[PDB]
Amino acid sequence: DKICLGHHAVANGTIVKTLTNEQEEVTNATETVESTSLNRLCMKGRNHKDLGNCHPIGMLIGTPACDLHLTGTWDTLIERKNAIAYCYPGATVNEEALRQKIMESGGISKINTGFTYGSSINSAGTTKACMRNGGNSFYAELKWLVSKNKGQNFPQTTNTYRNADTAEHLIMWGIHHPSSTQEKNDLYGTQSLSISVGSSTYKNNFVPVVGGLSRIDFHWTLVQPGDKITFSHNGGLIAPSRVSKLIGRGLGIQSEAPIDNSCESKCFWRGGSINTRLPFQNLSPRTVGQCPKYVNKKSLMLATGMRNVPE
Amino acid sequence: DKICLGHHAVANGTIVKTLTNEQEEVTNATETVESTSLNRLCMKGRNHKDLGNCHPIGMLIGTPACDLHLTGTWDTLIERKNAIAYCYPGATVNEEALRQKIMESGGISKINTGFTYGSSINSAGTTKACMRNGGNSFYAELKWLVSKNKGQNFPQTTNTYRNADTAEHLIMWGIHHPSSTQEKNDLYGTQSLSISVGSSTYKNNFVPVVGARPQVNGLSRIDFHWTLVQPGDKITFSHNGGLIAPSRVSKLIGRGLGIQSEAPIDNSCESKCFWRGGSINTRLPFQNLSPRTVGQCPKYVNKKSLMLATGMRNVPE
Amino acid sequence: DPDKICLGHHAVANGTIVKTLTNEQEEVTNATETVESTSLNRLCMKGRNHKDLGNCHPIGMLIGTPACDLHLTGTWDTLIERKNAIAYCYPGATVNEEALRQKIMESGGISKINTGFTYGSSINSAGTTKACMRNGGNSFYAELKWLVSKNKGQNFPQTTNTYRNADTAEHLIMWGIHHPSSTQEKNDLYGTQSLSISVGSSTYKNNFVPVVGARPQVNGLSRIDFHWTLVQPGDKITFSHNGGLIAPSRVSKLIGRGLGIQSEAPIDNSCESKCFWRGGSINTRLPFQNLSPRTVGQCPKYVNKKSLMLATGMRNVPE
Amino acid sequence: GLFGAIAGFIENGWEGMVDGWYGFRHQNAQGTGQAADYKSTQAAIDQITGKLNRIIKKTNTEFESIESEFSEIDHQIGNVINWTKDSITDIWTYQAELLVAMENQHTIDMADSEMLNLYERVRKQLRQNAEEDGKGCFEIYHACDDSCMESIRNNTYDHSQYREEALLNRLN
Amino acid sequence: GLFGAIAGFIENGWEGMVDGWYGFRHQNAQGTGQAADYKSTQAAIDQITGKLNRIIKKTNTEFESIESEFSEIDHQIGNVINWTKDSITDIWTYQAELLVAMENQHTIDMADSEMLNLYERVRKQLRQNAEEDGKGCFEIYHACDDSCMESIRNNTYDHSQYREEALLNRLN
Amino acid sequence: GLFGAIAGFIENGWEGMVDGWYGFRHQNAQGTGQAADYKSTQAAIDQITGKLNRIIKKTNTEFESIESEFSEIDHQIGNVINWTKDSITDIWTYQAELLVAMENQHTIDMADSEMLNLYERVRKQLRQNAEEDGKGCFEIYHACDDSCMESIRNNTYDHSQYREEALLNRLN
Ligand SMILES: *[C@@H]1O[C@H](CO)[C@@H](O[C@@H]2O[C@H](CO)[C@@H](O)[C@H](O)[C@H]2NC(C)=O)[C@H](O)[C@H]1NC(C)=O
Ligand SMILES: *[C@@H]1O[C@H](CO)[C@@H](O)[C@H](O)[C@H]1NC(C)=O
Ligand SMILES: *[C@@H]1O[C@H](CO)[C@@H](O)[C@H](O)[C@H]1NC(C)=O
Ligand SMILES: *[C@@H]1O[C@H](CO)[C@@H](O)[C@H](O)[C@H]1NC(C)=O
Ligand SMILES: *[C@@H]1O[C@H](CO)[C@@H](O)[C@H](O)[C@H]1NC(C)=O
Ligand SMILES: *[C@@H]1O[C@H](CO)[C@@H](O)[C@H](O)[C@H]1NC(C)=O
Ligand SMILES: [Ca+2]
Numbered sequence A: 001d002k003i004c005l006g007h008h009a010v011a012n013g014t015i016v017k018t019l020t021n022e023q024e025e026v027t028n029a030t031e032t033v034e035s036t037s038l039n040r041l042c043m044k045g046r047n048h049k050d051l052g053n054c055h056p057i058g059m060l061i062g063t064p065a066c067d068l069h070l071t072g073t074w075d076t077l078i079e080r081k082n083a084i085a086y087c088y089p090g091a092t093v094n095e096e097a098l099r100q101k102i103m104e105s106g107g108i109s110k111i112n113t114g115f116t117y118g119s120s121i122n123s124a125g126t127t128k129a130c131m132r133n134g135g136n137s138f139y140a141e142l143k144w145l146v147s148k149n150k151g152q153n154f155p156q157t158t159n160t161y162r163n164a165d166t167a168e169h170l171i172m173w174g175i176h177h178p179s180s181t182q183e184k185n186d187l188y189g190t191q192s193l194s195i196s197v198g199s200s201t202y203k204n205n206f207v208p209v210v211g212g213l214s215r216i217d218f219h220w221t222l223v224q225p226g227d228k229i230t231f232s233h234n235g236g237l238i239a240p241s242r243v244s245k246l247i248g249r250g251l252g253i254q255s256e257a258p259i260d261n262s263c264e265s266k267c268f269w270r271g272g273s274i275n276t277r278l279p280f281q282n283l284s285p286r287t288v289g290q291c292p293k294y295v296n297k298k299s300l301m302l303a304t305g306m307r308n309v310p311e
Numbered sequence B: 001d002k003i004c005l006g007h008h009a010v011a012n013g014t015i016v017k018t019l020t021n022e023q024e025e026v027t028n029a030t031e032t033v034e035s036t037s038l039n040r041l042c043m044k045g046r047n048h049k050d051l052g053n054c055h056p057i058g059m060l061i062g063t064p065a066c067d068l069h070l071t072g073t074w075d076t077l078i079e080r081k082n083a084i085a086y087c088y089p090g091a092t093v094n095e096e097a098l099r100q101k102i103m104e105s106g107g108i109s110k111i112n113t114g115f116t117y118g119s120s121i122n123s124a125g126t127t128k129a130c131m132r133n134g135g136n137s138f139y140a141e142l143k144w145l146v147s148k149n150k151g152q153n154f155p156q157t158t159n160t161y162r163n164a165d166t167a168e169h170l171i172m173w174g175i176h177h178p179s180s181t182q183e184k185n186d187l188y189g190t191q192s193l194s195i196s197v198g199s200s201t202y203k204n205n206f207v208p209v210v211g212a213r214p215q216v217n218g219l220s221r222i223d224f225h226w227t228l229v230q231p232g233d234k235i236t237f238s239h240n241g242g243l244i245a246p247s248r249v250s251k252l253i254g255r256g257l258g259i260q261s262e263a264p265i266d267n268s269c270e271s272k273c274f275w276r277g278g279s280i281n282t283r284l285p286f287q288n289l290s291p292r293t294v295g296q297c298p299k300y301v302n303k304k305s306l307m308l309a310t311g312m313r314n315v316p317e
Numbered sequence C: 001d002p003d004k005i006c007l008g009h010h011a012v013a014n015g016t017i018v019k020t021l022t023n024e025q026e027e028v029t030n031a032t033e034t035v036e037s038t039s040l041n042r043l044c045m046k047g048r049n050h051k052d053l054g055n056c057h058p059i060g061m062l063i064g065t066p067a068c069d070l071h072l073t074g075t076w077d078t079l080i081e082r083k084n085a086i087a088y089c090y091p092g093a094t095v096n097e098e099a100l101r102q103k104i105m106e107s108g109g110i111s112k113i114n115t116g117f118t119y120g121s122s123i124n125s126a127g128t129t130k131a132c133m134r135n136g137g138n139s140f141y142a143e144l145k146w147l148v149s150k151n152k153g154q155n156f157p158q159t160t161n162t163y164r165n166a167d168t169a170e171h172l173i174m175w176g177i178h179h180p181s182s183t184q185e186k187n188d189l190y191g192t193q194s195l196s197i198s199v200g201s202s203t204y205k206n207n208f209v210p211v212v213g214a215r216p217q218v219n220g221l222s223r224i225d226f227h228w229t230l231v232q233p234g235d236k237i238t239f240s241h242n243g244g245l246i247a248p249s250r251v252s253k254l255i256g257r258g259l260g261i262q263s264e265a266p267i268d269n270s271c272e273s274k275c276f277w278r279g280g281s282i283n284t285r286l287p288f289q290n291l292s293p294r295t296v297g298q299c300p301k302y303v304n305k306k307s308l309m310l311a312t313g314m315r316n317v318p319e
Numbered sequence D, E, F: 001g002l003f004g005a006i007a008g009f010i011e012n013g014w015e016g017m018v019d020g021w022y023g024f025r026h027q028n029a030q031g032t033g034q035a036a037d038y039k040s041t042q043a044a045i046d047q048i049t050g051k052l053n054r055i056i057k058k059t060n061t062e063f064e065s066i067e068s069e070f071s072e073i074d075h076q077i078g079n080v081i082n083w084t085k086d087s088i089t090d091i092w093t094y095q096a097e098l099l100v101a102m103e104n105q106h107t108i109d110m111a112d113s114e115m116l117n118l119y120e121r122v123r124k125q126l127r128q129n130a131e132e133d134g135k136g137c138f139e140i141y142h143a144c145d146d147s148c149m150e151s152i153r154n155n156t157y158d159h160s161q162y163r164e165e166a167l168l169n170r171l172n
Helices: A064-069 A095-103 A181-188 B056-061 B064-069 B095-103 B181-188 C058-063 C097-106 C183-190 D005-009 D038-055 D075-126 D146-153 D159-171 E038-055 E075-126 E146-153 E160-171 F005-009 F038-055 F075-126 F146-153 F159-171
Strands: A002-007 A014-016 A024-026 A029-031 A048-050 A076-079 A090-092 A107-112 A121-125 A127-132 A135-137 A142-147 A157-162 A169-177 A195-198 A203-206 A215-223 A228-233 A237-240 A242-246 A251-254 A267-269 A287-289 A301-303 B002-007 B014-016 B024-026 B029-031 B048-050 B076-079 B107-112 B121-125 B127-131 B142-147 B157-162 B169-177 B195-198 B203-206 B221-229 B234-239 B243-246 B248-252 B257-260 B273-275 B293-295 B307-309 C003-009 C016-018 C026-028 C031-033 C050-052 C078-081 C092-094 C109-114 C129-133 C144-146 C159-164 C171-178 C197-200 C205-208 C224-231 C236-241 C245-248 C250-254 C259-262 C275-277 C295-297 C309-311 D022-028 D031-036 D130-132 D137-140 E022-027 E032-036 E130-132 E137-140 F022-028 F031-036 F130-132 F137-140
Touching: A002 D075, A014 A029, A014 A301, A024 D075, A064 A127, A076 A095, A090 A095, A095 A251, A095 E075, A142 A169, A142 A181, A215 A228, A228 A237, A251 A287, A301 D038, A301 D075, B002 E075, B014 B029, B014 B307, B024 E075, B056 B064, B056 B095, B056 B169, B056 B221, B076 B095, B095 B257, B095 F075, B142 B169, B142 B181, B157 B243, B221 B234, B234 B243, B257 B293, B307 E038, B307 E075, C003 F075, C016 C309, C026 F075, C058 C097, C058 C171, C078 C097, C092 C097, C097 C250, C097 C259, C097 D075, C144 C171, C205 C224, C224 C236, C236 C245, C259 C295, C309 F038, C309 F075, D005 D075, D005 F075, D022 D038, D022 D075, D022 D146, D031 D146, D038 D075, D075 D137, D075 D146, D075 E075, D075 F075, E022 E038, E022 E075, E022 E146, E032 E146, E038 E075, E075 E137, E075 E146, E075 F005, E075 F075, F005 F075, F022 F038, F022 F075, F022 F146, F031 F146, F038 F075, F075 F137, F075 F146
Parallel strands: A048 A076, A076 A251, A090 A215, B048 B076, B076 B257, C050 C078, C078 C259, C092 C224
Antiparallel strands: A002 D022, A002 D137, A014 A024, A029 A301, A107 A242, A121 A142, A127 A135, A142 A237, A157 A228, A169 A215, A169 A237, A169 A242, A195 A203, A195 A228, A267 A287, B002 E022, B002 E137, B014 B024, B029 B307, B107 B248, B121 B142, B142 B243, B157 B234, B169 B221, B169 B243, B169 B248, B195 B203, B195 B234, B273 B293, C003 F022, C003 F137, C016 C026, C031 C309, C109 C250, C144 C245, C159 C236, C171 C224, C171 C245, C171 C250, C197 C205, C197 C236, C275 C295, D022 D031, D130 D137, E022 E032, E130 E137, F022 F031, F130 F137
């Protein structure tokens, strides 16, 4: 009589790597590197905002493209390719820092600056470049200040905004650099133009320069609770009508992929979502959110069983 | 007759994690993540400087709070919260890069500029904002230059500092931006003001701005600028009103450990690891106090505790 | 009385010490090093089409400094920069200097394409300076032209110069902006008119105003702000100006990819390698290396350890 | 392997064994049979489950964009970002390779050990009533019916019962 | 566990053994005893001490500040620094978790192996004068007084001295 | 060691065995001799070659210069680069130290296990014809000439032909 001890096996086993052996056969194994991506942004459980044609900077200054996105709250913000920040030609100083700061936020609210100007200032100047409601308009949160009577000197004006909130506010402004000397004199007169912005945490001076629409370069800063920021100008300033408060935190995603409210994900990239449970990932080094780690590896099989010894 | 083999056990076992079990009981275990800190800067065996009320930039321009910190050597420099850099209203361009350079240093030495001025210039301008010894004073390393006669035009002046040293020197200066046109005329005169600063490696031009936007208690402001004068090179200040000119230039000596912290000094303990809240003296390899430390430290980890087993499996009963 | 058979293992008189998880002084029969400690202190260029720049600086080869006359064009897979390399003969500074140097060092060759700018009779283009000496006489940057008025004092004419990218590969274009030392100098070269220089295209768009006394004076000479950008295939770049521009006579294209090696150590075609550093070269099969943390190529990882011995044998239990 | 049983003194596995990882095959006068051992099987599965619970997991650290997808980044800071990202990736690629190679080696030897621990508790149960054949079997020197074979598997085989009969057959 | 002794064929540990990690308990005519094995106890402790010497340790690399506690920093380079630091923190947190888990596994299994190696040493000493009961004990088939027991512990037991007597008692 | 053989019950290695890692020494009436075991020697060597193939290797990732050797980099960027380079070096130095310490521990324990495996293989072959002396030898209780010794070394020794003679010698 006999009793024999033994172990199971399978006909078709799986190859794994060990410390010792490249080609070790085992009864079962499982993948640790995810290779597939969903070609969409999985937005289930997320109060998201798809900006579409609106560029994040554009919702602070207020281009026509961003009229639906001037305020709101979100936990996720999606930026698309070729989104419009500027109707009238321009460039923001520290463009990328401002974009990323907006794309880290979980909302925007707008606060009136309350700025008032004398009778010799026309504040309602528009342009055919910023079209809204099939008519000439301008950036919704700014005002182009000009001399009311064409040719006259713009008066030395002082406008000061105080932050009365318990949170910091983001304030923007433009500086019109005229194209020719004729335009400069028609808009602001023949005087020396001197624009001066200043607070506790910020101070700068801007002198417009001469030399087919012209430029408007944008600037920005944060204004801390209880602090004032003061604009001293005599022509050239594109003054704010409202300031912005960035509310809480959120996840900025840059992707052309469509939104799907049926799937959930915590990790995103340019080409969509990566909602695997696996620890590793070979799809992209550029991701955001809570992600598996990128590895230069096609497959990596963890063994879930003994050696397979068939016969 | 029996002889039985066996192992020890304890009543009070301790839980650890293994490759295959989250809740494995063992006879003994030791912690690997440090959770506690000394609320003290352990400065034994260090030639240290506690700046206290003095901001690093204040050491170069000579603010009243920084009078004890104008020269020296150190291997460790402690900066504090809300430290003063300016007695008179103003700021420095490229401010944070300057503070970083000073906190990287192991000392400051001061060399005279040797700047002389013509008889129509009063170089001893003071103000009640920079009080010192119960009397109106000014930034100790700079001079507020004004006209001797109230109203007269400030003369077209030139000043050249040459670097005789074999290492680079840090030269600072200021530009006065007056409050009213009355001030601008009383000190510098009615002429248009040009200030020019030029070397082999630097050039810029400055124009005072009368009626500056940011003010406090009916006062003007004074903005500081800086650059490095290379060995042998000359730097020339051309000005006719509004320059705040350097009496001395600075030389940063070697290297030291900059610390930003709130905690008080203790000369009785050593330490090689520092953070906002104090010193970390643990022998443990990991740490969960802060991701922001300096010196030779245990690595930060997102873990309250991680127990290393120092004993066998605990099998009671 | 009874016979017997005994099991056993080999051993050696002197074993080697290695470190294990539990023992710092564990003796084994044999072991092998995993951290490379020896460097061949010469640049190993056996299987490499190399270019030793010598005195030439990479930026110098785009603008055409006298030091970079030999290296104005060519192809390579490896480019060797040296210490104290000359970029500028006439005092100058390039915007994004380090970026432009890295692009030239990442490339595998440069070829130069004529921009073909012509200028009117009232413009003097072929003016030279003694700061850039060439062949024992006064010269200038070969790939640039200092434009001034023909007659001293007279105003510089409003000139337009356009370059179209005729190639399928993108071209790199450079130009200077002269900010005069004095009003006297401005008038002598460009006249009394207020100066303005415009550069425009699809890719790049920027405007430059020359100003009196804006830049430093190295030996009494005004320092030139060099700028640069890329013209895409098919696209035009338009220089519109009226005095102050130092315009290109030639453009550059970056041929493919290559390996930049900054190293003052001597060259040697006897030795071969795939990994380099300032001190020399690192030829090794080992996974780790303690010569330098700043290497280039396909390199072993840098560790702060002299030696790490990997056991290739059992415990040595000698007799 | 390390413990000498699986791909060792056991010549091969049993494809017919589908209700367990380790088990018994007997033969006596009544015929033959097969049965899976629950505890040794479950001991090996539980350790692999625990191994999977640790490894099939990601960090809950929220990362954000430092490279714009739709615009140019500064050439200086971009080369720093790329070099950093590539350095991190080489570390994780290395760390993942080593993790799985190490875990795989341990898994194999761990399963090898549970086979041996099953074999060893049987040897000690049988005591002087059987002898090892070198192939994983125990030749039992007494009549051991289906109820006797059950008690070896159930861990209630009393060696005292069959000791006298067995010692005589072994000596002969 | 891997070697099958601790939390294996030895049912449990002894709270009363407070002068050693491993040891003996015996029964004979005289009465009972207990003693610890010094060598095996020390072999385990020495190996654990080795781990603590390697692990409880930091690097001597001097890191300087790249983040201001009291002033603002450039937002773009601040984001790169946050990304780099959080990436490094994820690496070290993973390395710590793995290290301790891998060492805890090896500690527990090393302890188990020393227990088995002691048992195996004692089995070979006793040779044919005793048999294994499956619980970590050896039933000795002769009178073994305290001097005899001590000889098993101190490794001086000659099997020749009791072989004839023991083989008679075993065969019965 | 883990498996109790090398630096365990085997008291020392044999410096004279130059043609293999593991082997046999015999003693019979005709004399004594020595021979290496090929199969267990290659088992150990093949596993070490496997470690070397995996470890003596470099990543195909090509790295480019971010710091300039011959000119001054920006102050704030350099600090970030320096902090990140020292952090990466600390990670790799730790990984390198851990890799080799872990690998060395496994190598010597693996080699130990191969010794035990050969010993257990021989133990099960000889069956009841021999007894363990506790030092890696088996005392064979019958006459075993040079070709009988070779059958043990060649794994073709049939216990049953010598079983009657051996059992008589063991009881007497
Ligand atoms: C880098 O990370 C730090 C720490 O997470 C950020 O600073 C915190 O920001 C939150 C708001 O998101 C504040 O409520 C905390 O008070 C800040 N903590 C500290 C210790 O400063 C910082 O904002 C991040 N940097 C950037 C550029 O986004
Ligand atoms: C083997 O692993 C696969 C996943 O790779 C799984 O689907 C399957 O259920 C496993 N087999 C079992 C548990 O028998
Ligand atoms: C074990 O625990 C004791 C206290 O019960 C402690 O003093 C000792 O340091 C621990 N052992 C080790 C090796 O850490
Ligand atoms: C040790 O092993 C290496 C390979 O790792 C081998 O080349 C060398 O000859 C061995 N050393 C000795 C002394 O045999
Ligand atoms: C960074 O890497 C990406 C792809 O690997 C590449 O497109 C980009 O040009 C790189 N950045 C720099 C500055 O070379
Ligand atoms: C970075 O480290 C090097 C030495 O490794 C040192 O010379 C240099 O000053 C450091 N860079 C900065 C910006 O401090
Ligand atoms: Ca952030």
